[PDB]
Design a binder for this molecule. Structure first.
Ligand SMILES: *[C@@H]1O[C@H](CO[C@@H]2O[C@@H](C)[C@@H](O)[C@@H](O)[C@@H]2O)[C@@H](O[C@@H]2O[C@H](CO)[C@@H](O[C@@H]3O[C@H](CO[C@H]4O[C@H](CO)[C@@H](O)[C@H](O)[C@@H]4O)[C@@H](O)[C@H](O[C@H]4O[C@H](CO)[C@@H](O)[C@H](O)[C@@H]4O)[C@@H]3O)[C@H](O)[C@H]2NC(C)=O)[C@H](O)[C@H]1NC(C)=O
Ligand SMILES: *[C@@H]1O[C@H](CO)[C@@H](O[C@@H]2O[C@H](CO)[C@@H](O[C@@H]3O[C@H](CO)[C@@H](O)[C@H](O)[C@@H]3O)[C@H](O)[C@H]2NC(C)=O)[C@H](O)[C@H]1NC(C)=O
Ligand SMILES: *[C@@H]1O[C@H](CO[C@@H]2O[C@@H](C)[C@@H](O)[C@@H](O)[C@@H]2O)[C@@H](O)[C@H](O)[C@H]1NC(C)=O
Ligand SMILES: *[C@@H]1O[C@H](CO[C@@H]2O[C@@H](C)[C@@H](O)[C@@H](O)[C@@H]2O)[C@@H](O)[C@H](O)[C@H]1NC(C)=O
Ligand code: NAG
Ligand code: MAN
Ligand code: MAN
Ligand code: MAN
Ligand code: MAN
Ligand code: MAN
Ligand code: MAN
Ligand code: CA
Ligand code: CA
Ligand code: CA
Ligand code: CA
Ligand code: CA
Ligand code: CA
Ligand code: CA
Ligand code: CA
Ligand code: CA
Ligand code: CA
Ligand code: CA
Ligand code: CA
Ligand code: CA
Ligand code: CA
Ligand code: CA
Ligand code: CA
Ligand code: CA
Ligand code: CA
Ligand code: CA
Ligand code: CA
Ligand code: CA
Ligand code: CA
Ligand code: CA
Ligand code: CA
Lengths: 522, 521
C-alpha cells in the first residue's frame, strides 16, 4: 500500500515523504476536511504541517526503545479524513543506525585461577551487550597476545571460553593482565574494551629442600643436659601456610637415638637429653623429615651423622695376675716373678698406657705383648740384707689430662742356706769344780745364724779325739737342742781340749766347730 | 708372638696348632709343670690337651660376638708354666666366613605417596644390615623391574645415608591404586646370601580431576503458567576422584541476574532446577543460566554448564480491543459501501493465540472488512431506512484462536438520523361539511387532522389554504385556518377549497386534501 523508510535519530523536521500528493489529494482538500493521524507506541514521533503539506520528525526516534533487539521495525499509522469519511493505512519502517557501541557488563573484571590447573581447561566469560541488530552488531572478539592463554568462541547463545595454552605458576608470574576488545562491523566503527586482571593462586607444589642430604657435626662425650648440636634449615618456595615448614624426626629412628637426642618442632634445633658415651656408641645417624602446612603437604628429608669424640674420662684398669709368693735368694737375673694385665676403656691417644715402677728397686719391668707386662728380676739379691719388697706399680694414662692407676704388690724372698752357724768367739775355756757330781751342767755353748728356719737350725755335736781312745770315759754329753754340756765324772789328778761342732739343717748343710778347753788336776 | 688362623664357628676339637713344639717345649716338661692357657673375652674358646701337647677349639667361636663389625679379629691367649715361671703369648686370628645374610630392618615396609608428586623426587629407604666383615658384606642393591620407579644408592660407602627411590614416570591413583615391588640386597661372598624387603606402596588420591558435565550446554522447554515449585531439569556432573574429592556441590554462577535468581532455584545436593516464581512470556522470552559446581577437596576445581530455557506463549490474555471514531449520526441517504466506525484490536499474546478473528451479527446488513494487517473497519452495505429501522446496536465478537480459545465482545450503539423523505397524509380525501343556516361570526366549524411517518420538524403538520377560483373571484378567502391545529372558522351566516398540509423541515414536502362546505341559507 505505502512504505516510507526513515533513519533512526534524525534532525528535527526531517523530510519523510509527500504523503499528501501521493494519496491523490491536494492541500486545498486537506485544509477543510478533518485530518486525523493516529499511531501506536508513542504516536507523537512524527507530525504533518499543513501550510506546505509535509510530514516531519518532531521528537527523537530511538528504534531500540520501541522494537528492542528485533529484526524488523515498523510503525503503523492510520489516517482518517471526514466529509466524506475516508481511511488510509500507512506503515513507516525505521532504519537502524550504529549508534550503540559494544558494552561490556563491567570495564574491569578480576578472575582467580589455581596454579595447578591443567591445560585445555576453559573459563566462562560474559560477552558484551549490544542493542543494535544486523551487521552493525558485535561479532568480532580480539584477545591480547598472551603466551599462557588463548580465546575460544562457539559458532552460533553460549558464553565464550578462555583456554589455558601454557601452564601457570605463582612464583614465576604472580599476576597476569590482559585486555579483551570487542569490535562491531558498523559505520562508524565502535569500541568495546574489558581489561582482565587475573591473580595466580599459590598451590603447594614446592617441596621443602635442605642445603645437602647429609651434614656432619662433631660432639664431645660428656655434654651436659640440653646441649645444642646443630640447627637445620629448610627452604620452601611457596607462600604463607604452604611456605613455612615444621621439623621432625623420621618414624624409622631407633629408640636409643630418640632417647639421647631431641628436636624442637618449630625451631628445628637438636639438643641432647640423654647421657651419651663414646664407649657406648661412637656415632649416631639420624634421619630428619620436614613438612609444610599445606593440605597436599610434601616432605623434605636429610640425614645428620654426628660423631662423638673420645675424652679421657676413664682410668686405666689393671689387674695383677699369677701371684708368686716365693723368690729364691740365688735367683739369677732374667727370671720373671708375676704377671700384669693393663686395660683402658678409652680409645686412641688416651687409650695407650705406659707402666713403670719404683726406680730404687733391683727389679725391672718389661712387656712382651700388647698391654701385658711381665715383672723380670734384675741385679743380685740377698735375703738377710733385705727380706721382702712391697713394689708399687704406677700406670700412666696419656692425654690431657693424664690419669694414674697404682697397684701394691707384696713379694717376699725365700731363704737359701748360704750362711754357716757361728759361735760368738773362739776359743772357749772353762774350769770345773774338783768334786764334780754326775749329770751336772758345766757350760752352755752358743751359736747363731743369719738364715731362717732349718737353715738357721743349730745342731751341736762332739768330736771323738785320741783322748777318747785313752779310755777314761765317753766323757761329757751335749744336748743338740740347747747346747748344754753335761759332766758325769768327779775330777781326778793324774789339759782337755775338744771341738764342739754346730751344723745347719739345710740341704747344702754347713757347719763350724769351736774349741772348748777345760783344765783340772785337783 | 705366634700366629694361628682359625675359621669362625669350627667343629669341636678342631686342630689349631702344635703349640708345644712350636714354643720349644718338650712333652716331658709339659706334663708335670702346670701348663695354663688363659684369654680375655670368654677365655674358654681354646684349650690344650696335654697327652699329646696340642691346641684345639673347646667352645663355639662366634666372631661377631667378639669383634662385632670390626675389620680385624684376633684372640690373645697367654701361656703360663711353673717351675721355673715362664710366660708365652700367642695370638690367634679369626677368619670371617659368610654365615650372616644381608638383613633388612623389616621384611615388609609400606610407603604412602601422593599422586601429585613431581618427577625427580626421591624417597628415603633404610639399607640392609650385615654382621659379616670384609668382601662378604653387602654392597650391591637390585630393585624390582618397575616402570615408574628407579633405585638410587650413594657410592662412597654403605650406611652413610639411606638409599632413595626416584620417580622416573609420574603416577596416578585412578590408573594404578597400589604398587608392589621387591628390593634385593646381595653381598659379595661365597656362597652368596640375599636379603629382601617387600615394598607395598599406595597411591594417595589428589584432587586433580575437575568436575565435568555431559555437555557444555543443555536445552529445556518450559510452560508459562507452571505452579510454585515446578521441576525444570536435573543436571549431572562427572568426577573421577575419590571420596570427598569425588562428590560435587551444585550452585548458580556469581554472574547470574537477580531476576534469574528470583525465578529459578537449585538444590545443592540434587542439582535440580525448580521455578519458585511466576514466569511470563511477555516479561521475558527466554532465560540463559550459568551454573557452577565445586567439589569438597581443598584444592577444589569448578565445573561450568549453561542451561537455556525457552518460555512458551500460553493463551492467558484476552485480545484487548478499543472502539474508535464514535459516529452518532448516520444519514438515511448514505450509499452502500460506506464505513461507519473504527475498531482497533490488539493482543498481548503471540503466535497461534496472537492472531485474532473478528465477526459481527449474521442477521445484519452491515459487513466487516479489513484493509491492512489486524486493523478492521466496519463498512455499511445495502440500503437502510429510518422509519423501517430506528437504531442499530452492532455487537462485534472477537475470537482468539488456539487451545483453549479466548473471547472478547464489544457493544456499539449507532443511531440513524431522520431525513425528510415522506409526505403528510390525511385520513382520507375528500372531506365535506354542512354549516349551520344561521351561522354566527367567528364560529368553530371543524378540526382537520394530518399525520406523517417522519420525526421532529419533518413530522410537523402545518395547515394552509389555496387561492382557488372562488377565492380569486374575491367573494372571500372562505374559512380561515390555524396552521398549528387545522381548525376552520366561519364568519358569515357551494364552496370547494383545497387544504394544504405541509412540513416544517428545510426540505419541506406537502400534500393537499379537498374540503367542501355547503350553505345556501
Ligand atoms: C635432660 O633434659 C631433658 C629436657 O631438656 C631440658 O628441658 C627443656 C625444657 C629445656 O629447658 C632444656 O634446655 C633442658 O636441658 C629432660 O627431659 C625432661 O624430663 C622431665 C621428667 O623427667 C619432663 O617433665 C615432664 O614434662 C611434661 C611435659 O611434657 C612436654 O614434652 C614435650 C617437650 O617438648 C612436649 O610434648 C611439650 O612441650 C610438653 O610440655 C609434664 O607434663 C610432666 O608433668 C606431668 O606429670 C606430673 C606428675 O604426675 C603432673 O603433676 C603434671 O600435671 C603432668 O601431668 C613432667 O613435668 C620434661 O618435660 C622433660 N623435658 C622435655 C623437654 O620434654 C631430661 O630429664 C634431662 N635428663 C636428666 C637425666 O634429667
Ligand atoms: C633459613 O635461612 C634463611 C636465610 O638465612 C632465613 O630466611 C629469612 O627470611 C627471609 C625469607 O624469605 C630471608 O630472605 C628475605 O626475604 C625478604 C622478602 O622480601 C627480603 O625482603 C629480605 O631482605 C630477605 O632477603 C631472610 O634473609 C632471612 N631473615 C632472617 C632474619 O633469618 C630463614 O629464617 C631460615 N630458617 C629459619 C627456620 O629460620
Ligand atoms: C548421573 O547419571 C548417572 C548415569 O550415567 C552415569 O553418568 C555419566 C556422566 C557417565 O559417567 C555414565 O558412564 C554413568 O553411568 C546416574 O547413575 C547418576 O545417579 C547421575 N547423577 C546423580 C547425581 O544422580
Ligand atoms: C512460592 O513459594 C515460596 C516459598 O517456597 C519455599 O521454598 C520452596 C523451595 C518450597 O519448598 C515451598 O514449599 C516453600 O514454602 C514463596 O516465598 C513465594 O512467595 C511463592 N511465590 C508465589 C506464591 O508466587
Ligand atoms: C773346725 O773349724 C776349722 C776352721 O777352719 C776347720 O779347719 C776344721 O776342719 C773344723 N773341724 C772339722 C772337724 O771339720
Ligand atoms: C575499538 O575499536 C577501534 C577501531 O574500531 C579501536 O581504535 C579501539 O582501540 C578499540 O579496539
Ligand atoms: C576499555 O579498555 C581500555 C584499555 O584498558 C581502556 O582504556 C578503556 O577506558 C576501557 O576501560
Ligand atoms: C696407688 O694408690 C692405690 C690406692 O688404693 C694404692 O693401693 C697403691 O699402692 C698406690 O699407692
Ligand atoms: C748362748 O747364747 C744363746 C743365744 O744366742 C743362748 O740362748 C744360750 O743359752 C747361750 O747363753
Ligand atoms: C639372592 O641371590 C642368591 C644368588 O645370588 C640366591 O642364592 C639367594 O637365594 C637370593 O635369591
Ligand atoms: C624378600 O624377597 C623375596 C623375593 O626375592 C620374597 O620371596 C620374600 O618373601 C621377601 O619379601
Ligand atoms: Ca539508538
Ligand atoms: Ca541503533
Ligand atoms: Ca553495535
Ligand atoms: Ca609452583
Ligand atoms: Ca610448599
Ligand atoms: Ca607455589
Ligand atoms: Ca665415658
Ligand atoms: Ca671416653
Ligand atoms: Ca683413659
Ligand atoms: Ca744370704
Ligand atoms: Ca745356715
Ligand atoms: Ca740366706
Ligand atoms: Ca658367626
Ligand atoms: Ca661371619
Ligand atoms: Ca654378609
Ligand atoms: Ca589424576
Ligand atoms: Ca586423583
Ligand atoms: Ca574432584
Ligand atoms: Ca501471560
Ligand atoms: Ca503468554
Ligand atoms: Ca491472546
Ligand atoms: Ca425515510
Ligand atoms: Ca427519514
Ligand atoms: Ca416528514
Amino acid at each position: 500500500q505505502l512504505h516510507y523508510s526513515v533513519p533512526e535519530e534524525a534532525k528535527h523536521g526531517t523530510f519523510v515523504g509527500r504523503i499528501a500528493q501521493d494519496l491523490g489529494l491536494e492541500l486545498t482538500e486537506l485544509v477543510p476536511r478533518l485530518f486525523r493521524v493516529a499511531s501506536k507506541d508513542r504516536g507523537d514521533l512524527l507530525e504533518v504541517n499543513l501550510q506546505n503539506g509535509i510530514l516531519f520528525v518532531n521528537s527523537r526516534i530511538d528504534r531500540e526503545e520501541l522494537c528492542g533487539r528485533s529484526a524488523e521495525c515498523s510503525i503503523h499509522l492510520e489516517v482518517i479524513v471526514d466529509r466524506p469519511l475516508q481511511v488510509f493505512h500507512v506503515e513507516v519502517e525505521v532504519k537502524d543506525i550504529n549508534d550503540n557501541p559494544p558494552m561490556f557488563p563491567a570495564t574491569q573484571k578480576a578472575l582467580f585461577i589455581l596454579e595447578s590447573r591443567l591445560l585445555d581447561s576453559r573459563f566462562p566469560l560474559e560477552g558484551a551487550s549490544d542493542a543494535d541488530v544486523g551487521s552493525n552488531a558485535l561479532l568480532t572478539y580480539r584477545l591480547s597476545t598472551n603466551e599462557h592463554f588463548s580465546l575460544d568462541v562457539p559458532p552460533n547463545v553460549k558464553p565464550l571460553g578462555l583456554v589455558l595454552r601454557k601452564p601457570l605458576d605463582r612464583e614465576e608470574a604472580a599476576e597476569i593482565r590482559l585486555l579483551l576488545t570487542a569490535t562491531d562491523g558498523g559505520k562508524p566503527e565502535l569500541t568495546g574494551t574489558v581489561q582482565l586482571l587475573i591473580t595466580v593462586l599459590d598451590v603447594n607444589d614446592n617441596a621443602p629442600v635442605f642445603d645437602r642430604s647429609l651434614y656432619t657435626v662433631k660432639l664431645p662425650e660428656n655434654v651436659p643436659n640440653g646441649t645444642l648440636v646443630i640447627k637445620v634449615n629448610a627452604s620452601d618456595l611457596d607462600e604463607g601456610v604452604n611456605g613455612d615448614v615444621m621439623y621432625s624426626f623420621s618414624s624409622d629412628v631407633s629408640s636409643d637415638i630418640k632417647s639421647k637426642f631431641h628436636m624442637d618442632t618449630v625451631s628445628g634445633e637438636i639438643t641432647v637429653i640423654g647421657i651419651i658415651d663414646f664407649e657406648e656408641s661412637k656415632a649416631y645417624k639420624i634421619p630428619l623429615e620436614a613438612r609444610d602446612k599445606g593440605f597436599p603437604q610434601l616432605p623434605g628429608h636429610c640425614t645428620i651423622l654426628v660423631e662423638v669424640v673420645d675424652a679421657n674420662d676413664n682410668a686405666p684398669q689393671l689387674t695383677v695376675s699369677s701371684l708368686s709368693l716365693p723368690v729364691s735368694e740365688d735367683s739369677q737375673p732374667g727370671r720373671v716373678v708375676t704377671l700384669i694385665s693393663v686395660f683402658d676403656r678409652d680409645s686412641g691417644a688416651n687409650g695407650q698406657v705406659t707402666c713403670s715402677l719404683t726406680p730404687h728397686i733391683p727389679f725391672k719391668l718389661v712387656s712382651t705383648f700388647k698391654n701385658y707386662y711381665s715383672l723380670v728380676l734384675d741385679s743380685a739379691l740377698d735375703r738377710e740384707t733385705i727380706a721382702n719388697y712391697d713394689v708399687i706399680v704406677t700406670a700412666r694414662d696419656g692425654g690431657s689430662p693424664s690419669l694414674w692407676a697404682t697397684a701394691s704388690v707384696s713379694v717376699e724372698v725365700a731363704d737359701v742356706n748360704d750362711n754357716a752357724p757361728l759361735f760368738a768367739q773362739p776359743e772357749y775355756t772353762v774350769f770345773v769344780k774338783e768334786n764334780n757330781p754326775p749329770g751336772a751342767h758345766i757350760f752352755t755353748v752358743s751359736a747363731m745364724d743369719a738364715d731362717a728356719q732349718e737353715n738357721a737350725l743349730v745342731s751341736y755335736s762332739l768330736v771323738e779325739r785320741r783322748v777318747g781312745e785313752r779310755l777314761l770315759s765317753s766323757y761329757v754329753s751335749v744336748h743338740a737342742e740347747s747346747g748344754k754340756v753335761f759332766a758325769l765324772q768327779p775330777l781326778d789328778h793324774e789339759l782337755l781340749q775338744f771341738q764342739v761342732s754346730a751344723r745347719d739343717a739345710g740341704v747344702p748343710a754347713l757347719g763350724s766347730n769351736v774349741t772348748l778347753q777345760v783344765f783340772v788336776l785337783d
